[PDB]
PDB file of C-alpha atoms and ligand atoms in Angstrom:
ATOM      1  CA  UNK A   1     -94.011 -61.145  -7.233  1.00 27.36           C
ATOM      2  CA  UNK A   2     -95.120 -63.802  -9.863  1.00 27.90           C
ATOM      3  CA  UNK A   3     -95.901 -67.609  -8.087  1.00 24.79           C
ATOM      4  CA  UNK A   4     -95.077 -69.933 -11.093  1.00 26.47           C
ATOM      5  CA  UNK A   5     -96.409 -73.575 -10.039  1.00 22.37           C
ATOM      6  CA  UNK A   6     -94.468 -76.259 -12.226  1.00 22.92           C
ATOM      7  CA  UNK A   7     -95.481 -79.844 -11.421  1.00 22.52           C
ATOM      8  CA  UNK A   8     -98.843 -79.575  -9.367  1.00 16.39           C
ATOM      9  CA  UNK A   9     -99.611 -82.213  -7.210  1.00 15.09           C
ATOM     10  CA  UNK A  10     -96.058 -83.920  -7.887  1.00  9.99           C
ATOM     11  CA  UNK A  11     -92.960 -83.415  -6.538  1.00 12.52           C
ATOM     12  CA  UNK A  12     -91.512 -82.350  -3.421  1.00 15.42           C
ATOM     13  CA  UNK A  13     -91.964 -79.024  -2.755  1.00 15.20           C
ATOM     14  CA  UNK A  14     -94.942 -79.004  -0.181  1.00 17.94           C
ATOM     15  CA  UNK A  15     -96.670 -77.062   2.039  1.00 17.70           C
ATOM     16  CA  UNK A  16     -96.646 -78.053   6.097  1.00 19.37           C
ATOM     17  CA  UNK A  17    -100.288 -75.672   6.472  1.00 20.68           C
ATOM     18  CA  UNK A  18    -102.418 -79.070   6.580  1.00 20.59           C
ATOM     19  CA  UNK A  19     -99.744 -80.984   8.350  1.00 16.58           C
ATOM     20  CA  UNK A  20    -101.034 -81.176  11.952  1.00 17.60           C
ATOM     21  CA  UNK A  21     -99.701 -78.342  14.347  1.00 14.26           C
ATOM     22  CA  UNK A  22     -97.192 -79.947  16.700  1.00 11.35           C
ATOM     23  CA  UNK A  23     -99.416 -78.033  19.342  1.00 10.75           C
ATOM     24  CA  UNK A  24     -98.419 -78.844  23.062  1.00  8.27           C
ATOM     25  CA  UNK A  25     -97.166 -81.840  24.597  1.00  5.38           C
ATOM     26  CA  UNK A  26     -99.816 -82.802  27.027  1.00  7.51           C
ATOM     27  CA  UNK A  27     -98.469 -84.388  30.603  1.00  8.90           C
ATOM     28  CA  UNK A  28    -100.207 -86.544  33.407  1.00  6.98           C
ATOM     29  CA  UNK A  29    -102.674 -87.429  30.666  1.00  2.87           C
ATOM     30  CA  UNK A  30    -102.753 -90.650  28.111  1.00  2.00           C
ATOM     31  CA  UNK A  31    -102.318 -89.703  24.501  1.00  2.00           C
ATOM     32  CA  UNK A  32    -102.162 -91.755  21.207  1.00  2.00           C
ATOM     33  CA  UNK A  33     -98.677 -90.453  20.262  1.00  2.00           C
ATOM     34  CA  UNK A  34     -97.002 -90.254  16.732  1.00  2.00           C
ATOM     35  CA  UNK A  35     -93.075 -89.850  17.511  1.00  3.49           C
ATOM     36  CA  UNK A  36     -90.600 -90.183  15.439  1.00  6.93           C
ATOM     37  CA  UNK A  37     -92.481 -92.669  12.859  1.00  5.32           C
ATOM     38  CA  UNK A  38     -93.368 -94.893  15.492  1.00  6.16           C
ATOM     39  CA  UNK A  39     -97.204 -94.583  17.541  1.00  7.82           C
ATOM     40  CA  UNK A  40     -98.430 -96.465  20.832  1.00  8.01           C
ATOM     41  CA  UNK A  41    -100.184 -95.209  23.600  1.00  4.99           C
ATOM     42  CA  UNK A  42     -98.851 -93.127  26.648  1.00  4.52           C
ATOM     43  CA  UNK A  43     -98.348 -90.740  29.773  1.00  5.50           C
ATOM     44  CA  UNK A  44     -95.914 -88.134  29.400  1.00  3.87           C
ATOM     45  CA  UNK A  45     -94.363 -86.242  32.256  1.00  2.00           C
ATOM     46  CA  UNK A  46     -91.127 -83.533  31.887  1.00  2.00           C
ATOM     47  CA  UNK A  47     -87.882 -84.420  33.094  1.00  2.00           C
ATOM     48  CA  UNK A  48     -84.203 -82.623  32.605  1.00  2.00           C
TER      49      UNK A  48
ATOM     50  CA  UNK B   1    -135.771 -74.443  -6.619  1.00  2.33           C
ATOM     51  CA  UNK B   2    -137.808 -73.378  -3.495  1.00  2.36           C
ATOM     52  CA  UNK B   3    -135.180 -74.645  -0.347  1.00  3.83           C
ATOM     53  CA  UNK B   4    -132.035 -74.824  -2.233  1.00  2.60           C
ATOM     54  CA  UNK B   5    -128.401 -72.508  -2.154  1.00  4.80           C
ATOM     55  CA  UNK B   6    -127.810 -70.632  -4.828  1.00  3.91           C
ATOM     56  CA  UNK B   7    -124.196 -71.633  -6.363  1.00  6.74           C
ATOM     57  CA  UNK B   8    -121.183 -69.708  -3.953  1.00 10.13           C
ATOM     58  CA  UNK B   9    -119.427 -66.814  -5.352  1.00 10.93           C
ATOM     59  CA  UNK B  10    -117.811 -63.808  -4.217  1.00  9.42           C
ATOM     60  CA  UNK B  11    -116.946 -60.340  -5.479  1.00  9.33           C
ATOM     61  CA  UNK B  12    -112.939 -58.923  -4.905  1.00  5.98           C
ATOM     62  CA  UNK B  13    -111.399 -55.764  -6.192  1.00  7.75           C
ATOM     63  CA  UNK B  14    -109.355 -57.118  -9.041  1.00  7.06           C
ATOM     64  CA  UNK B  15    -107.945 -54.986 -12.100  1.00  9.61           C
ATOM     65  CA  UNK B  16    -109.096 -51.840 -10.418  1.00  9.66           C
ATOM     66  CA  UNK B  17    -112.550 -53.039 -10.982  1.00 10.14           C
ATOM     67  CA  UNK B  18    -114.823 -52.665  -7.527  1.00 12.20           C
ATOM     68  CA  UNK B  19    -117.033 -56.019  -9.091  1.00 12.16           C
ATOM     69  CA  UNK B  20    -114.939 -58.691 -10.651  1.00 11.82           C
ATOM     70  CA  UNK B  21    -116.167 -62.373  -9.537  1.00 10.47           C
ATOM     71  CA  UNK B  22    -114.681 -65.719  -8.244  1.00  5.95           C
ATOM     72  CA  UNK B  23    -117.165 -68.599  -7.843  1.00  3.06           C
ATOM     73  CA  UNK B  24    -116.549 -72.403  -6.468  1.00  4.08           C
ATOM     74  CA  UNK B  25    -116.173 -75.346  -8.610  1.00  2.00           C
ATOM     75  CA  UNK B  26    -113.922 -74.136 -10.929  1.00  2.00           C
ATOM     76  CA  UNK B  27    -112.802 -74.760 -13.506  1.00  4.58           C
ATOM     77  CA  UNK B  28    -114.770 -78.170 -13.550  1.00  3.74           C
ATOM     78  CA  UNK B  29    -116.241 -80.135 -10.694  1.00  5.78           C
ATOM     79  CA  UNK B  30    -113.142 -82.972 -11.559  1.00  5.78           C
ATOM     80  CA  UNK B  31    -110.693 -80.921 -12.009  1.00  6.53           C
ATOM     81  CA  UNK B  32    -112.409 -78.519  -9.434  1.00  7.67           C
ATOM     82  CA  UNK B  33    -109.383 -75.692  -7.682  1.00  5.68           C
ATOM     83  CA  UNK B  34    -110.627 -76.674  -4.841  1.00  5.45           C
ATOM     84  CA  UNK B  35    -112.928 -79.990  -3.300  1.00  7.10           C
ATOM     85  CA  UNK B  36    -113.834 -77.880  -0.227  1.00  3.72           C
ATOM     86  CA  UNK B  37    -116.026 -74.973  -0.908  1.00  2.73           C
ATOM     87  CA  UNK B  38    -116.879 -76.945  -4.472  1.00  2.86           C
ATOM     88  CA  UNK B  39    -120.421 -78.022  -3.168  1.00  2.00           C
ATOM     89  CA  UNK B  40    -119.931 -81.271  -5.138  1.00  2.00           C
ATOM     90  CA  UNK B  41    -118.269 -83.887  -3.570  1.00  2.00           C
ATOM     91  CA  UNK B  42    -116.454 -86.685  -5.194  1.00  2.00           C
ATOM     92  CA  UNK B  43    -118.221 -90.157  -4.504  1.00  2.00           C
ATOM     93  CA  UNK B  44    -117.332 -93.739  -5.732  1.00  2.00           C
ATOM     94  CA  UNK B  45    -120.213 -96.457  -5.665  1.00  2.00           C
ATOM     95  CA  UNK B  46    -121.202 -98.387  -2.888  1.00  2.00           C
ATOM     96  CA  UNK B  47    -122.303-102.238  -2.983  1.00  2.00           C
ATOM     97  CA  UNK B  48    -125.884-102.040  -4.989  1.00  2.00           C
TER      98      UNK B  48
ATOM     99  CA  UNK C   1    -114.379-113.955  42.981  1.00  4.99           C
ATOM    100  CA  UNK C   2    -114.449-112.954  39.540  1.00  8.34           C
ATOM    101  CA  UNK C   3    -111.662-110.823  37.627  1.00  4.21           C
ATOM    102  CA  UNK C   4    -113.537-108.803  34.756  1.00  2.29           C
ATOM    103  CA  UNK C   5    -112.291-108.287  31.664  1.00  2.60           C
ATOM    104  CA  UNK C   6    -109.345-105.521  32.036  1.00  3.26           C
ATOM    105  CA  UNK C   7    -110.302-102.119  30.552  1.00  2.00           C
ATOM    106  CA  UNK C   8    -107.926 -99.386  29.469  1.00  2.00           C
ATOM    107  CA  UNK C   9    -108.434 -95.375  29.737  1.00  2.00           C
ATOM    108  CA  UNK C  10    -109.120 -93.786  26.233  1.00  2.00           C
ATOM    109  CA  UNK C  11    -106.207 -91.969  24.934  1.00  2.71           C
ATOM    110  CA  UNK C  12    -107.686 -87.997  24.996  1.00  3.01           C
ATOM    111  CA  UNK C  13    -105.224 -85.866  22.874  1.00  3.40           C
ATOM    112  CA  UNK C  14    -102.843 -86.788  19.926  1.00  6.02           C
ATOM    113  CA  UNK C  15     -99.389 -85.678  19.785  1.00  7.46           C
ATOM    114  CA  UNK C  16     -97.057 -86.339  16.714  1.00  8.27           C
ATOM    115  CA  UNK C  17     -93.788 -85.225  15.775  1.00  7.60           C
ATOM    116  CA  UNK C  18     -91.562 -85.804  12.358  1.00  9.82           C
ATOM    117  CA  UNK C  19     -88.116 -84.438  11.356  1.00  8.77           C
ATOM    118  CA  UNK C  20     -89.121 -82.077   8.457  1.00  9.53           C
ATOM    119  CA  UNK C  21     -86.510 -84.594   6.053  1.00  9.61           C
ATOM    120  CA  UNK C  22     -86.499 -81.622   3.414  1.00 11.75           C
ATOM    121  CA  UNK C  23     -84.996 -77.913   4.421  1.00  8.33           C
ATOM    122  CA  UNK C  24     -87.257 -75.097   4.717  1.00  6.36           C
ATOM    123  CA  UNK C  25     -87.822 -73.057   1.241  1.00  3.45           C
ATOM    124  CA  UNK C  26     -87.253 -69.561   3.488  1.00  5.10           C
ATOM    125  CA  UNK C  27     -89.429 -67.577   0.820  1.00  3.43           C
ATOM    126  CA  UNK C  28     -90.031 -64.914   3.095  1.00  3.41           C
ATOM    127  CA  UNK C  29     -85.962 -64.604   3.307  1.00  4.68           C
ATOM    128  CA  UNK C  30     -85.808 -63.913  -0.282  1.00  3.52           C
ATOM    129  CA  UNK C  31     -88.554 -61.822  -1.048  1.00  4.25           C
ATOM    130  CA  UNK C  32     -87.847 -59.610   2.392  1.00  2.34           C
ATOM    131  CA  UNK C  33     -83.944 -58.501   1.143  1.00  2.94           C
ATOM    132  CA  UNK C  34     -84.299 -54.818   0.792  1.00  2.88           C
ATOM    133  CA  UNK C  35     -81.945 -55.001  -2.353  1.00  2.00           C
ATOM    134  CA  UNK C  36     -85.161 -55.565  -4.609  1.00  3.41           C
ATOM    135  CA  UNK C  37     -84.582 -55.194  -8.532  1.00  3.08           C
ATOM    136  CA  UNK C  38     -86.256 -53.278 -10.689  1.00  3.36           C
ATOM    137  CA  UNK C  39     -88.639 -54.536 -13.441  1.00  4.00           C
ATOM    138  CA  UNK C  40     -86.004 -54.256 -16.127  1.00  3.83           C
ATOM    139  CA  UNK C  41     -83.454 -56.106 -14.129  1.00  3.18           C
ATOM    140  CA  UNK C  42     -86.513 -58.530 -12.872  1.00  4.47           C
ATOM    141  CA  UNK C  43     -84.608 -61.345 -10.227  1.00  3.83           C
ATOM    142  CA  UNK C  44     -85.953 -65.272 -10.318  1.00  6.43           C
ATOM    143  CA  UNK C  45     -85.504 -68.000  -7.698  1.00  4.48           C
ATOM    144  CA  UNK C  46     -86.779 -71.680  -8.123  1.00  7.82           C
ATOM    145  CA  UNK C  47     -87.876 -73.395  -4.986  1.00 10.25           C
ATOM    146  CA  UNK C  48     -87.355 -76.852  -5.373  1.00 14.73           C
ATOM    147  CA  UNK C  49     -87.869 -80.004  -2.880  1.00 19.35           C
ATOM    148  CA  UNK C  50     -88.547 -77.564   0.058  1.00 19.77           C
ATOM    149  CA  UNK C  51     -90.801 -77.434   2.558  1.00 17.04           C
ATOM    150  CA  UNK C  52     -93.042 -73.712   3.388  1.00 15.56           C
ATOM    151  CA  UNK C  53     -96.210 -72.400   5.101  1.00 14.39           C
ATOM    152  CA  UNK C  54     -98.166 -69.823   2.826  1.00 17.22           C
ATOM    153  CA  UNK C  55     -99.913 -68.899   5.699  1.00 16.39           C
ATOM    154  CA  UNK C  56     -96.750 -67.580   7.707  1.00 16.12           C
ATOM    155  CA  UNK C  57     -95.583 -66.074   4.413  1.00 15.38           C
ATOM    156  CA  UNK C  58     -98.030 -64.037   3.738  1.00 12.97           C
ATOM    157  CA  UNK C  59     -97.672 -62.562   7.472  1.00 12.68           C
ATOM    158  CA  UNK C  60     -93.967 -62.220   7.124  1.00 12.27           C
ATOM    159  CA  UNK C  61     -93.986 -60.283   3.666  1.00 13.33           C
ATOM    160  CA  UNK C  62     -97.183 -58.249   4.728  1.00 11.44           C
ATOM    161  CA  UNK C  63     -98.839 -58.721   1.680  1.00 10.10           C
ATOM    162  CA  UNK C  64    -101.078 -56.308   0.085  1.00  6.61           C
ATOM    163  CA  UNK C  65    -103.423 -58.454  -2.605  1.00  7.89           C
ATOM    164  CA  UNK C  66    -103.027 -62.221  -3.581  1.00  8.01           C
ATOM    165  CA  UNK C  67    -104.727 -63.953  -6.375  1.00  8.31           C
ATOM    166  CA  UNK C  68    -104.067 -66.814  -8.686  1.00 12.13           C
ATOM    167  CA  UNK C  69    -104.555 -68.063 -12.589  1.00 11.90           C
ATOM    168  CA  UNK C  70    -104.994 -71.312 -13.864  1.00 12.83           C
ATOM    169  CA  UNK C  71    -104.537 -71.760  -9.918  1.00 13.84           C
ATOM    170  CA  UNK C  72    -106.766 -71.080  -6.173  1.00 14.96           C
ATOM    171  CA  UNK C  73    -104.576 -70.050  -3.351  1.00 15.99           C
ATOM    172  CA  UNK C  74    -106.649 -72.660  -0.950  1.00 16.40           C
ATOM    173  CA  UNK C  75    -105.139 -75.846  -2.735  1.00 15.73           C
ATOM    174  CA  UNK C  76    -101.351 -74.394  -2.338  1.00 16.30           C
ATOM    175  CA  UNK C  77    -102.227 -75.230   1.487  1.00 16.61           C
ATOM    176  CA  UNK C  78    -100.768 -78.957   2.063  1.00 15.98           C
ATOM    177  CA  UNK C  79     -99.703 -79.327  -1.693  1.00 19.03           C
ATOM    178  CA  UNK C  80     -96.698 -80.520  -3.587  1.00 19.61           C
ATOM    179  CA  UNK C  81     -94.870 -79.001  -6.689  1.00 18.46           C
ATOM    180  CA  UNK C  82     -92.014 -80.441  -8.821  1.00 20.91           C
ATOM    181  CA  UNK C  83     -90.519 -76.670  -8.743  1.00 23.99           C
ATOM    182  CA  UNK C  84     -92.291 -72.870  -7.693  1.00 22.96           C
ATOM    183  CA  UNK C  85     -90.716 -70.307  -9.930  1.00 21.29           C
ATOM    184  CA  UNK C  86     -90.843 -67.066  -7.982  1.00 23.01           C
ATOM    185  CA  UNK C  87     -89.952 -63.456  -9.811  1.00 25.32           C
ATOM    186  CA  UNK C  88     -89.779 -60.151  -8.451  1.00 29.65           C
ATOM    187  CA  UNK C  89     -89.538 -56.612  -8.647  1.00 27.27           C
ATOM    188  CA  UNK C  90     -90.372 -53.067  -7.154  1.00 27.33           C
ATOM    189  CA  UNK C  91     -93.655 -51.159  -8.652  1.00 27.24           C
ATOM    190  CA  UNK C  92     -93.155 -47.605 -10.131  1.00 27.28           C
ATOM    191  CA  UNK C  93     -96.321 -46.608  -8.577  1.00 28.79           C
ATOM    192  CA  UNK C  94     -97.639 -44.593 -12.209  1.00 29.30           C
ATOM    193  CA  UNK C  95     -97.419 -48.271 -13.833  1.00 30.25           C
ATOM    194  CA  UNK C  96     -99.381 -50.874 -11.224  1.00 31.20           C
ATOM    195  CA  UNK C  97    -101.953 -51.315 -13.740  1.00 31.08           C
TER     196      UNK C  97
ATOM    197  CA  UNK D   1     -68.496 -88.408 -13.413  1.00 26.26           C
ATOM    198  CA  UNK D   2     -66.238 -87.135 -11.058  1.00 22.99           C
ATOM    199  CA  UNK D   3     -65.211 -84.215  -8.595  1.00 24.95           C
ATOM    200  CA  UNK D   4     -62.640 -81.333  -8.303  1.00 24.87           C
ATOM    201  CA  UNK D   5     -60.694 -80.386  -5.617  1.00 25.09           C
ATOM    202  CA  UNK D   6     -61.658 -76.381  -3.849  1.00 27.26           C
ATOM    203  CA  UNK D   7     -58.579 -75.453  -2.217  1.00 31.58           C
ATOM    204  CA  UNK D   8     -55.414 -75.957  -4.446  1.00 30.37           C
ATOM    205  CA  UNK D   9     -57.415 -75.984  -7.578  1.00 29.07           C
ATOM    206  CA  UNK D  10     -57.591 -78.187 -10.369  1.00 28.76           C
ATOM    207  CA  UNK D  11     -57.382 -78.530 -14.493  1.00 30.90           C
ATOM    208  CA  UNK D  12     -61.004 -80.040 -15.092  1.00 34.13           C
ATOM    209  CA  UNK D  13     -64.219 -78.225 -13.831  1.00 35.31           C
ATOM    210  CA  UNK D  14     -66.300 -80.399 -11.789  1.00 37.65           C
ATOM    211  CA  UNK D  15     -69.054 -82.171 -13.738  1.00 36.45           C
ATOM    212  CA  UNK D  16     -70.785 -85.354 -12.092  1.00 36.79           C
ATOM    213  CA  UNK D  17     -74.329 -84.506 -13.422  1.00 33.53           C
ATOM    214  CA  UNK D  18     -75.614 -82.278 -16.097  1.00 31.71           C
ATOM    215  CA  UNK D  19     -79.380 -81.132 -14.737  1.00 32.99           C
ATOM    216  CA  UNK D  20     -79.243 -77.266 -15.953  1.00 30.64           C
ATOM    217  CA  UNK D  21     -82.174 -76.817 -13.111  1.00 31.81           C
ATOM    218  CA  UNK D  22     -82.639 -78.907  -9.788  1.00 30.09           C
ATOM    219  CA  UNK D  23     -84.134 -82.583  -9.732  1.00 33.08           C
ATOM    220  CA  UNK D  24     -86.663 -84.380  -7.731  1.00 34.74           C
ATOM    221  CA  UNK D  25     -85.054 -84.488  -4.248  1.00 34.67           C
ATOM    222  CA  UNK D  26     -86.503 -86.990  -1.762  1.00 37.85           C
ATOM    223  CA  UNK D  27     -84.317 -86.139   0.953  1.00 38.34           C
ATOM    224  CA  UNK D  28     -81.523 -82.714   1.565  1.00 39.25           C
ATOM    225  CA  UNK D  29     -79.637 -82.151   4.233  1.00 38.35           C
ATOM    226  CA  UNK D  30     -76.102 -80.187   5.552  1.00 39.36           C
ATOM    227  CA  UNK D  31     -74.272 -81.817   8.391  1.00 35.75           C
ATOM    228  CA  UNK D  32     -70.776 -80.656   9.867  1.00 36.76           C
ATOM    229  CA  UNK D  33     -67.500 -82.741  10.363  1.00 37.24           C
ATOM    230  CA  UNK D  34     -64.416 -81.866  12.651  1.00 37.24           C
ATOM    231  CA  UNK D  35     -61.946 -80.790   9.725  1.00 34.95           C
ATOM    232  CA  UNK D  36     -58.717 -81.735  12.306  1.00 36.44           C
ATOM    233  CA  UNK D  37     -59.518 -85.221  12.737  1.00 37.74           C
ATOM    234  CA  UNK D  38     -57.464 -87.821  10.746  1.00 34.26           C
ATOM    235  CA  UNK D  39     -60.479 -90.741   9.776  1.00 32.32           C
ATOM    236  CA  UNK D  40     -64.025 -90.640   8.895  1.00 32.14           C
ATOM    237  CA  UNK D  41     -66.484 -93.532   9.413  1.00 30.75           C
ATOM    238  CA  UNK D  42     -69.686 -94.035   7.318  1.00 29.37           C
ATOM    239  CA  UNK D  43     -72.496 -96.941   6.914  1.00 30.98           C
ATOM    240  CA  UNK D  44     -74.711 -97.409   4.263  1.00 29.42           C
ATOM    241  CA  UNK D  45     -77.331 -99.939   4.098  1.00 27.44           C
ATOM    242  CA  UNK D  46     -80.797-100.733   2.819  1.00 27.85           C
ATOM    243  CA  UNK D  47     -83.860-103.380   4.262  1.00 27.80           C
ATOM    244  CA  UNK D  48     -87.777-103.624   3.398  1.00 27.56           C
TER     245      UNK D  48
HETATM  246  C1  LIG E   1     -74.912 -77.621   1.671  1.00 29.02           C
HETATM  247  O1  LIG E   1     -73.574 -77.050   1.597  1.00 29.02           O
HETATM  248  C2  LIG E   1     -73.143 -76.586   0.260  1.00 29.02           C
HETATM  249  C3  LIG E   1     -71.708 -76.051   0.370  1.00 29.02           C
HETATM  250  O2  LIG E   1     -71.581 -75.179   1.512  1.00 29.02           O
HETATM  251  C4  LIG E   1     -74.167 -75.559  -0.249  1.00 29.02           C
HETATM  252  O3  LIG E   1     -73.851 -75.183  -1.607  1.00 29.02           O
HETATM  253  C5  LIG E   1     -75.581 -76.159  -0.269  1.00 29.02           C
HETATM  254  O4  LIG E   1     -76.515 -75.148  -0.737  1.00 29.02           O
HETATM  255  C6  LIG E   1     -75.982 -76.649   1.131  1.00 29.02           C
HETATM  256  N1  LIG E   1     -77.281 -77.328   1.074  1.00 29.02           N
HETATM  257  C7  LIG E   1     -78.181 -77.278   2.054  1.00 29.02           C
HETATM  258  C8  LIG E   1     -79.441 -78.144   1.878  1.00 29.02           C
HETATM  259  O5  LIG E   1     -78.019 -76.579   3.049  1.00 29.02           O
HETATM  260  C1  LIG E   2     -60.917 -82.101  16.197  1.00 30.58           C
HETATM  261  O1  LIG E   2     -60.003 -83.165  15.770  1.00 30.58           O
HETATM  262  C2  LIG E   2     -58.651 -83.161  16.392  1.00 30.58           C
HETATM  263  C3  LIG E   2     -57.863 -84.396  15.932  1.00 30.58           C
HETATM  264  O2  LIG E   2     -58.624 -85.601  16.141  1.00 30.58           O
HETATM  265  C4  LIG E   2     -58.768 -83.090  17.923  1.00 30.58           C
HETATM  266  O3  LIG E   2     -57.456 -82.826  18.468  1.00 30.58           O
HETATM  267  C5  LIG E   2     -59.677 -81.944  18.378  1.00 30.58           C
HETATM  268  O4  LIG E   2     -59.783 -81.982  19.829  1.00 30.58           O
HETATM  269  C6  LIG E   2     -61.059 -82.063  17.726  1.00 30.58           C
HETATM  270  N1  LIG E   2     -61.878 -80.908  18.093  1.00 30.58           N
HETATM  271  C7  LIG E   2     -63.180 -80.999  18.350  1.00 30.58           C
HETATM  272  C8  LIG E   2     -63.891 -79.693  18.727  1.00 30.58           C
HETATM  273  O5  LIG E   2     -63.770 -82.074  18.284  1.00 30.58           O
END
């Protein structure tokens, strides 16, 4: 297969490799959190 | 010079040749492929 | 009896999350159908305003070799494009050269 | 520009832009709709 790169650095066809991983959502321990669009500072514990 | 790296490159098996050669900073230090293994780094002025 | 200035615990891991907003550019789905052309009949597929992980490509095709022109394949990671134009076909083993 | 209609055909082909390969696309998304119900609601605003 041939890659054909029109537009570099433009546009919107990205790639999500150096986006941060959404890794594991930590509980019983404060975190700067990034949710949504929206950050504070918080505790998280699971719930149903 | 005595202490200093000599400029990165590496060797890949390319066009059935065992030897062909990539090295950093291409094609320009500018408009460099990549800022991260280029081993010079973009830098505006500071005050004085 | 003197109340000290309140502190606060330091925040120790970061967690964010984002809807993706674009739909995923499912590469792997296209060049994985096992109805593959043949050079004379060569297939082409724009990916436009998507969003993909070379990294997870590359495992999901098991690729063989990768190299670019004009092009490194460390700067694809986290980059944009206006449009990838991707073409394909099946190698007649005589002719990879 | 307008639209045609898919199920009981129509005389015009449907032609509400002319780009012969896709645009710049900020945003792309399918969602679904119960095709039984009688009314549709939208709302469509804009701020900052
Ligand atoms: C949305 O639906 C239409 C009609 O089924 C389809 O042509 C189009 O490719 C879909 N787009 C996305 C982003 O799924
Ligand atoms: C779909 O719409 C009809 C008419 O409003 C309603 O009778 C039906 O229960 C709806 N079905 C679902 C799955 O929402």
């Amino acid at each position: 297969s041939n890659f054909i790169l029109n537009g570099i650095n433009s546009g919107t066809t990205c790639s999500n490799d150096l986006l941060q991983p959404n890794t594991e959502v930590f509980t019983d321990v404060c975190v700067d959190y990034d949710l949504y669009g929206i950050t504070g500072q918080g505790i998280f514990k699971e719930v149903s | 010079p005595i202490g200093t790296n000599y400029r990165s490159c590496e060797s890949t098996t390319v066009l059935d040749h065992t030897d062909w050669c990539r090295c950093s900073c291409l094609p320009d230090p500018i408009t460099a492929y990549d800022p991260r293994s280029c081993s010079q780094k973009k830098s505006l002025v500071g005050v004085g | 009896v003197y109340d000290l200035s309140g502190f606060t615990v330091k925040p120790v891991a970061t967690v964010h999350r984002r809807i993706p907003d674009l739909p995923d550019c499912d590469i792997d789905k296209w060049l994985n159908n096992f109805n593959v052309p043949s050079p004379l009949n060569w297939e082409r597929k724009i990916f436009s305003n998507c969003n993909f992980n070379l990294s997870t490509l590359l495992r999901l095709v098991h690729t063989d070799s990768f190299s670019c022109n004009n092009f490194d394949e460390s700067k694809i990671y986290g980059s944009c494009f206006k449009s990838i134009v991707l073409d394909k076909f099946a190698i007649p083993n005589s002719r990879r050269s | 520009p307008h639209t045609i209609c898919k199920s009981k055909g129509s005389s015009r082909n449907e032609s509400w832009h002319f780009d012969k390969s896709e645009p710049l696309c900020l945003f792309k998304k399918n969602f679904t709709y119960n095709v039984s119900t009688d009314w549709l609601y939208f709302h469509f605003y804009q701020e900052r």
